[PDB]
Amino acid sequence: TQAVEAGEKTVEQFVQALNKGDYNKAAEMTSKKAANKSALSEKEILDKYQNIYGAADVKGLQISNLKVDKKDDSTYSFSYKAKMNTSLGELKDLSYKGTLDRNDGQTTINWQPNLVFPEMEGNDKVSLTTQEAARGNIIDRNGEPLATTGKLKQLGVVPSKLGDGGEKTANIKAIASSFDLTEDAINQAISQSWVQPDYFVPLKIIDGATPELPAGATIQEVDGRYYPLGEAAAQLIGYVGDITAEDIDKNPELSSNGKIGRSGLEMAFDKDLRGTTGGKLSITDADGVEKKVLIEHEVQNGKDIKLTIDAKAQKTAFDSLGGKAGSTVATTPKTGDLLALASSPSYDPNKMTNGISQEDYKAYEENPEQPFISRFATGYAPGSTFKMITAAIGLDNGTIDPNEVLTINGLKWQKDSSWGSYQVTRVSDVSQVDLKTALIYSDNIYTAQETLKMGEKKFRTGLDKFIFGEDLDLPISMNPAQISNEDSFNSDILLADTGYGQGELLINPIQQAAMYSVFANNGTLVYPKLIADKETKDKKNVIGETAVQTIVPDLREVVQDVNGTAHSLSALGIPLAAKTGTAEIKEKQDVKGKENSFLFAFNPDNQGYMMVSMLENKEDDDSATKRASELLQYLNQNYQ
Ligand SMILES: *C(=O)[C@H]([C@@H](C)O)[C@H]1CC(SCCNC=N)=C(C(=O)O)N1
């Protein structure tokens, strides 16, 4: 039985080498070329597998049900079932069979062309025909296009019809000034090594009306992905890029001639958007007549995907950031629909997917404000806005009396001398501060004191009812929000800092809109939702209903009171509840401290919408509040 042991080993070593793509090592386990031995030599077995398995992009060959028996005295017969992955899907239940050879102290495989595919004879060919699937569309809550396939106007030049000598320089300057192009860049395009004097050298895509075409300029229609909102939704949607040979090795079911999502929803929903390649993989005669069809099915185009996004709100939210670093999240807080996910600054996804220069791409990467960051999915310290949560927790466990008045003298405060030179700082020197006053003026010292009075254990008990540590069901890469680095603060200072939204808190804007939704649902947290068809999910009894009825009237005062931190929003004349905030940061970079500005705002009459905006590393006298009027006007009109 020691012979069939070595035969089973030989067959599995042969299958392993085929699975790994080392066709040479597989061929060197075959017998000499003869009639009842190997049908081909080693070098032509190599080329057989390399051409056929390479044409169909075979990957992941694995066998089962291996039986090795005895035929003659030195001839052992094997058989097994097998499956493999190709460019047209998985190929299952393949019945392979053959014979072995025990000559000296080694066993080899009598190779036959039926060990490539079952039922191949001598000189049979393999044919593969494919039809590429059309990529699906991404559309908003009202069916407007966010990412669609269609026809684009491609501009290029033919160096021959452009002219020579001084005739050339005049036309090149005419092209460069008629389409906003660098005169030195048109020459670098026509000077590339691939160019022949008569070829059409593409230059850029024209996304509007095309002016007069000077001599040598041409315009050709071409199919390609198009993003109608451009940079206004680049971080969310993403972009597609040309598929590489290294992508095909990872997943053979891609179209080597098509596009793959590189970031954003295009990448998160690539499998649903790309569809499936249609076609047929068949074995033919030495002539070419069809012997057996191995795989065949029709092309299935990609499904469309409907988002909760509002295209008008998304554009308004992004424009309001004015190219500064920041982000804005808008929801309908009773259902969790994500109306807008803006991040700024941004990149051009149309320029990204239609070929971008090395310099322009580096300008994006070297940009200190980093336009590639999805800021709506990046953990930040929430800032003073978080005082709402601490207050609601304090009202639930009875630590905070809404009418008790703390007496605060000055702008700085510390628990005792053990804090050293550290002090909680506030902006307004109000002496008598109750809860309503602390929310109107945004008083850290009040919140820091009520947090320390509450204590860590009661503070965390309230915080644990939220979504810290949870993974939201969203097709957006993000990390779970955290209260702090460890399970305990181990610091009175860190406890007070966390009270008014500083410390080691990390919560991204989407997770913030989820937590703050309790004030629009009588203490019920409503999870955010991006896919329009999905069902609303929530989480009851996060904070008490009594706390909501207490805090929301005070949040109205943040807008209506003449000294409220959001009083500029009272100009809108719409029912508003708001809370502004500030987070001071930086630690191991520059000496000057950087400041983040926050705004939370929702309609407290109908709970129709909710907004969380931020400015990262704000310039002086800039704030999220002074930029929010236009989006609030829109959301109030169209989402009651
Ligand atoms: C949080 O409540 C902040 C505090 C942590 O800085 C306070 C201060 C601000 S206003 C910005 C003053 N400059 C530097 N701190 C408010 C606010 O309502 O924005 N809350």
PDB file of C-alpha atoms in Angstrom, residues 53-223:
ATOM      1  CA  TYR A  53      -5.443  28.437 -18.115  1.00  0.00           C
ATOM      2  CA  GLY A  54      -4.128  31.934 -18.807  1.00  0.00           C
ATOM      3  CA  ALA A  55      -6.729  32.634 -21.487  1.00  0.00           C
ATOM      4  CA  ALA A  56      -9.598  31.685 -19.154  1.00  0.00           C
ATOM      5  CA  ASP A  57      -7.842  33.180 -16.081  1.00  0.00           C
ATOM      6  CA  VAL A  58      -8.053  29.912 -14.149  1.00  0.00           C
ATOM      7  CA  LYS A  59      -7.455  30.318 -10.423  1.00  0.00           C
ATOM      8  CA  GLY A  60      -8.017  28.307  -7.262  1.00  0.00           C
ATOM      9  CA  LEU A  61      -7.974  24.720  -8.508  1.00  0.00           C
ATOM     10  CA  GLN A  62      -8.973  22.361  -5.698  1.00  0.00           C
ATOM     11  CA  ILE A  63      -9.862  18.673  -5.819  1.00  0.00           C
ATOM     12  CA  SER A  64     -11.845  16.158  -3.752  1.00  0.00           C
ATOM     13  CA  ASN A  65     -12.867  12.485  -3.716  1.00  0.00           C
ATOM     14  CA  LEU A  66      -9.389  11.300  -4.711  1.00  0.00           C
ATOM     15  CA  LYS A  67      -9.211   7.574  -5.484  1.00  0.00           C
ATOM     16  CA  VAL A  68      -5.941   5.903  -6.499  1.00  0.00           C
ATOM     17  CA  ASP A  69      -6.066   2.230  -7.492  1.00  0.00           C
ATOM     18  CA  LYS A  70      -3.956  -0.318  -9.401  1.00  0.00           C
ATOM     19  CA  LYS A  71      -4.273  -1.197 -13.085  1.00  0.00           C
ATOM     20  CA  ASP A  72      -1.113  -3.056 -14.153  1.00  0.00           C
ATOM     21  CA  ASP A  73       1.982  -4.069 -12.202  1.00  0.00           C
ATOM     22  CA  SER A  74       3.642  -0.646 -12.614  1.00  0.00           C
ATOM     23  CA  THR A  75       0.612   1.421 -13.731  1.00  0.00           C
ATOM     24  CA  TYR A  76      -1.648   3.004 -11.097  1.00  0.00           C
ATOM     25  CA  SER A  77      -4.886   4.767 -12.071  1.00  0.00           C
ATOM     26  CA  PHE A  78      -6.237   7.879 -10.341  1.00  0.00           C
ATOM     27  CA  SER A  79      -9.453   9.898 -10.410  1.00  0.00           C
ATOM     28  CA  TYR A  80     -10.899  12.896  -8.586  1.00  0.00           C
ATOM     29  CA  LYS A  81     -13.537  15.609  -8.717  1.00  0.00           C
ATOM     30  CA  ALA A  82     -12.384  19.205  -9.008  1.00  0.00           C
ATOM     31  CA  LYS A  83     -13.529  22.808  -9.183  1.00  0.00           C
ATOM     32  CA  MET A  84     -11.837  26.007 -10.306  1.00  0.00           C
ATOM     33  CA  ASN A  85     -12.496  29.719 -10.765  1.00  0.00           C
ATOM     34  CA  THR A  86     -12.452  31.350 -14.215  1.00  0.00           C
ATOM     35  CA  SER A  87     -13.323  34.732 -15.724  1.00  0.00           C
ATOM     36  CA  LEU A  88     -16.915  33.468 -16.171  1.00  0.00           C
ATOM     37  CA  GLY A  89     -17.440  32.164 -12.623  1.00  0.00           C
ATOM     38  CA  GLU A  90     -16.778  28.940 -10.756  1.00  0.00           C
ATOM     39  CA  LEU A  91     -16.525  25.648 -12.664  1.00  0.00           C
ATOM     40  CA  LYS A  92     -17.697  22.854 -10.347  1.00  0.00           C
ATOM     41  CA  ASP A  93     -17.894  19.055 -10.456  1.00  0.00           C
ATOM     42  CA  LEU A  94     -15.169  18.208 -12.960  1.00  0.00           C
ATOM     43  CA  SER A  95     -14.411  14.498 -13.405  1.00  0.00           C
ATOM     44  CA  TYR A  96     -10.684  14.017 -14.014  1.00  0.00           C
ATOM     45  CA  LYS A  97      -8.969  10.671 -14.528  1.00  0.00           C
ATOM     46  CA  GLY A  98      -5.618   9.308 -15.604  1.00  0.00           C
ATOM     47  CA  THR A  99      -2.835   6.836 -14.922  1.00  0.00           C
ATOM     48  CA  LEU A 100       0.464   6.961 -13.034  1.00  0.00           C
ATOM     49  CA  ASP A 101       3.825   5.199 -13.391  1.00  0.00           C
ATOM     50  CA  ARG A 102       6.114   3.589 -10.807  1.00  0.00           C
ATOM     51  CA  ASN A 103       9.486   3.092 -12.498  1.00  0.00           C
ATOM     52  CA  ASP A 104      12.424   3.515 -10.125  1.00  0.00           C
ATOM     53  CA  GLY A 105      11.783   4.920  -6.660  1.00  0.00           C
ATOM     54  CA  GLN A 106       9.563   7.701  -7.993  1.00  0.00           C
ATOM     55  CA  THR A 107       6.010   8.009  -9.314  1.00  0.00           C
ATOM     56  CA  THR A 108       5.037  10.279 -12.220  1.00  0.00           C
ATOM     57  CA  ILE A 109       1.845  11.195 -14.081  1.00  0.00           C
ATOM     58  CA  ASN A 110       1.127   9.874 -17.558  1.00  0.00           C
ATOM     59  CA  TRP A 111       0.059  13.310 -18.750  1.00  0.00           C
ATOM     60  CA  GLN A 112      -2.800  13.610 -21.233  1.00  0.00           C
ATOM     61  CA  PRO A 113      -4.658  16.675 -22.550  1.00  0.00           C
ATOM     62  CA  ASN A 114      -7.693  15.517 -20.523  1.00  0.00           C
ATOM     63  CA  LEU A 115      -5.872  16.753 -17.395  1.00  0.00           C
ATOM     64  CA  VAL A 116      -6.405  20.325 -18.640  1.00  0.00           C
ATOM     65  CA  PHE A 117     -10.163  19.921 -19.002  1.00  0.00           C
ATOM     66  CA  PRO A 118     -12.152  16.671 -18.909  1.00  0.00           C
ATOM     67  CA  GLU A 119     -12.843  15.225 -22.367  1.00  0.00           C
ATOM     68  CA  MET A 120     -10.014  16.927 -24.262  1.00  0.00           C
ATOM     69  CA  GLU A 121      -8.313  14.852 -26.972  1.00  0.00           C
ATOM     70  CA  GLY A 122      -4.864  15.231 -28.541  1.00  0.00           C
ATOM     71  CA  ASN A 123      -5.038  18.574 -30.333  1.00  0.00           C
ATOM     72  CA  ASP A 124      -8.298  20.161 -29.171  1.00  0.00           C
ATOM     73  CA  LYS A 125      -8.507  23.926 -28.712  1.00  0.00           C
ATOM     74  CA  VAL A 126     -10.227  26.099 -26.109  1.00  0.00           C
ATOM     75  CA  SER A 127     -12.250  29.195 -26.979  1.00  0.00           C
ATOM     76  CA  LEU A 128     -13.366  32.045 -24.709  1.00  0.00           C
ATOM     77  CA  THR A 129     -15.833  34.766 -25.722  1.00  0.00           C
ATOM     78  CA  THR A 130     -16.915  37.483 -23.281  1.00  0.00           C
ATOM     79  CA  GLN A 131     -19.310  40.432 -23.256  1.00  0.00           C
ATOM     80  CA  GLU A 132     -18.556  43.096 -20.659  1.00  0.00           C
ATOM     81  CA  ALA A 133     -21.277  44.142 -18.244  1.00  0.00           C
ATOM     82  CA  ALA A 134     -22.388  47.760 -18.094  1.00  0.00           C
ATOM     83  CA  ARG A 135     -21.701  49.329 -14.708  1.00  0.00           C
ATOM     84  CA  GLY A 136     -24.726  50.193 -12.605  1.00  0.00           C
ATOM     85  CA  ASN A 137     -25.712  53.670 -11.474  1.00  0.00           C
ATOM     86  CA  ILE A 138     -25.674  55.377  -8.078  1.00  0.00           C
ATOM     87  CA  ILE A 139     -28.677  57.683  -7.629  1.00  0.00           C
ATOM     88  CA  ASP A 140     -30.101  59.784  -4.817  1.00  0.00           C
ATOM     89  CA  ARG A 141     -33.376  59.595  -2.877  1.00  0.00           C
ATOM     90  CA  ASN A 142     -35.241  61.261  -5.779  1.00  0.00           C
ATOM     91  CA  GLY A 143     -33.570  59.405  -8.652  1.00  0.00           C
ATOM     92  CA  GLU A 144     -31.088  62.109  -9.652  1.00  0.00           C
ATOM     93  CA  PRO A 145     -27.754  60.768 -10.967  1.00  0.00           C
ATOM     94  CA  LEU A 146     -24.746  60.672  -8.653  1.00  0.00           C
ATOM     95  CA  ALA A 147     -22.592  58.209 -10.627  1.00  0.00           C
ATOM     96  CA  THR A 148     -23.665  57.162 -14.131  1.00  0.00           C
ATOM     97  CA  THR A 149     -22.228  55.761 -17.339  1.00  0.00           C
ATOM     98  CA  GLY A 150     -22.636  57.681 -20.572  1.00  0.00           C
ATOM     99  CA  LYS A 151     -20.997  59.614 -23.387  1.00  0.00           C
ATOM    100  CA  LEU A 152     -18.296  62.242 -22.838  1.00  0.00           C
ATOM    101  CA  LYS A 153     -16.733  64.851 -25.129  1.00  0.00           C
ATOM    102  CA  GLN A 154     -13.031  64.006 -25.465  1.00  0.00           C
ATOM    103  CA  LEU A 155     -10.777  66.662 -27.006  1.00  0.00           C
ATOM    104  CA  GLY A 156      -7.497  65.805 -28.694  1.00  0.00           C
ATOM    105  CA  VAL A 157      -5.116  66.830 -31.460  1.00  0.00           C
ATOM    106  CA  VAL A 158      -3.454  65.137 -34.427  1.00  0.00           C
ATOM    107  CA  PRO A 159       0.160  66.378 -34.742  1.00  0.00           C
ATOM    108  CA  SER A 160       0.105  66.071 -38.547  1.00  0.00           C
ATOM    109  CA  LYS A 161      -2.896  68.331 -39.230  1.00  0.00           C
ATOM    110  CA  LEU A 162      -1.660  70.809 -36.605  1.00  0.00           C
ATOM    111  CA  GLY A 163       1.024  72.283 -38.869  1.00  0.00           C
ATOM    112  CA  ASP A 164       4.797  72.562 -38.821  1.00  0.00           C
ATOM    113  CA  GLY A 165       7.214  75.347 -37.953  1.00  0.00           C
ATOM    114  CA  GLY A 166       5.597  78.623 -36.962  1.00  0.00           C
ATOM    115  CA  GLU A 167       2.218  77.322 -38.122  1.00  0.00           C
ATOM    116  CA  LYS A 168       2.416  74.771 -35.303  1.00  0.00           C
ATOM    117  CA  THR A 169       3.159  77.223 -32.485  1.00  0.00           C
ATOM    118  CA  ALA A 170       0.210  79.427 -33.478  1.00  0.00           C
ATOM    119  CA  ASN A 171      -2.298  76.561 -33.417  1.00  0.00           C
ATOM    120  CA  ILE A 172      -0.932  75.130 -30.152  1.00  0.00           C
ATOM    121  CA  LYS A 173      -1.347  78.529 -28.496  1.00  0.00           C
ATOM    122  CA  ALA A 174      -4.851  78.663 -29.991  1.00  0.00           C
ATOM    123  CA  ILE A 175      -5.763  75.294 -28.460  1.00  0.00           C
ATOM    124  CA  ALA A 176      -4.188  76.137 -25.099  1.00  0.00           C
ATOM    125  CA  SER A 177      -6.097  79.430 -24.784  1.00  0.00           C
ATOM    126  CA  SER A 178      -9.427  78.122 -26.132  1.00  0.00           C
ATOM    127  CA  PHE A 179      -9.825  75.307 -23.571  1.00  0.00           C
ATOM    128  CA  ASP A 180      -7.803  76.479 -20.514  1.00  0.00           C
ATOM    129  CA  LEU A 181      -4.733  74.326 -21.141  1.00  0.00           C
ATOM    130  CA  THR A 182      -1.031  74.886 -20.581  1.00  0.00           C
ATOM    131  CA  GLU A 183       0.840  75.620 -23.806  1.00  0.00           C
ATOM    132  CA  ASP A 184       3.813  73.620 -22.501  1.00  0.00           C
ATOM    133  CA  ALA A 185       1.540  70.705 -21.565  1.00  0.00           C
ATOM    134  CA  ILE A 186       0.084  70.247 -25.060  1.00  0.00           C
ATOM    135  CA  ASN A 187       3.643  69.816 -26.325  1.00  0.00           C
ATOM    136  CA  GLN A 188       4.453  67.289 -23.590  1.00  0.00           C
ATOM    137  CA  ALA A 189       1.413  65.254 -24.662  1.00  0.00           C
ATOM    138  CA  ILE A 190       2.393  65.092 -28.348  1.00  0.00           C
ATOM    139  CA  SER A 191       6.037  64.419 -27.402  1.00  0.00           C
ATOM    140  CA  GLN A 192       5.361  61.178 -25.515  1.00  0.00           C
ATOM    141  CA  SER A 193       7.010  58.063 -26.925  1.00  0.00           C
ATOM    142  CA  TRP A 194       3.747  56.339 -27.890  1.00  0.00           C
ATOM    143  CA  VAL A 195       2.709  59.115 -30.293  1.00  0.00           C
ATOM    144  CA  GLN A 196       2.893  58.729 -34.078  1.00  0.00           C
ATOM    145  CA  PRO A 197       2.484  61.872 -36.224  1.00  0.00           C
ATOM    146  CA  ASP A 198      -1.024  60.863 -37.385  1.00  0.00           C
ATOM    147  CA  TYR A 199      -2.513  59.603 -34.106  1.00  0.00           C
ATOM    148  CA  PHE A 200      -5.272  61.331 -32.150  1.00  0.00           C
ATOM    149  CA  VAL A 201      -3.638  62.480 -28.898  1.00  0.00           C
ATOM    150  CA  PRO A 202      -6.297  63.020 -26.196  1.00  0.00           C
ATOM    151  CA  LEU A 203      -5.952  66.118 -24.030  1.00  0.00           C
ATOM    152  CA  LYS A 204      -8.955  66.656 -21.722  1.00  0.00           C
ATOM    153  CA  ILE A 205     -12.701  66.116 -21.314  1.00  0.00           C
ATOM    154  CA  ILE A 206     -15.080  68.983 -22.124  1.00  0.00           C
ATOM    155  CA  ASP A 207     -17.966  69.058 -19.636  1.00  0.00           C
ATOM    156  CA  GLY A 208     -19.934  71.837 -21.357  1.00  0.00           C
ATOM    157  CA  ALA A 209     -20.350  73.598 -24.677  1.00  0.00           C
ATOM    158  CA  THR A 210     -17.432  73.180 -27.068  1.00  0.00           C
ATOM    159  CA  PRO A 211     -16.152  76.428 -28.654  1.00  0.00           C
ATOM    160  CA  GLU A 212     -14.603  76.955 -32.086  1.00  0.00           C
ATOM    161  CA  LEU A 213     -12.111  74.198 -32.905  1.00  0.00           C
ATOM    162  CA  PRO A 214      -8.830  75.631 -34.274  1.00  0.00           C
ATOM    163  CA  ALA A 215      -6.746  73.738 -36.827  1.00  0.00           C
ATOM    164  CA  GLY A 216      -5.704  70.294 -35.629  1.00  0.00           C
ATOM    165  CA  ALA A 217      -8.277  70.070 -32.819  1.00  0.00           C
ATOM    166  CA  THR A 218     -10.813  67.240 -32.795  1.00  0.00           C
ATOM    167  CA  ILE A 219     -13.625  66.067 -30.528  1.00  0.00           C
ATOM    168  CA  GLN A 220     -14.616  62.409 -30.202  1.00  0.00           C
ATOM    169  CA  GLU A 221     -17.396  60.789 -28.199  1.00  0.00           C
ATOM    170  CA  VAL A 222     -16.376  58.107 -25.700  1.00  0.00           C
ATOM    171  CA  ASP A 223     -18.146  56.114 -23.000  1.00  0.00           C
TER     172      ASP A 223
END
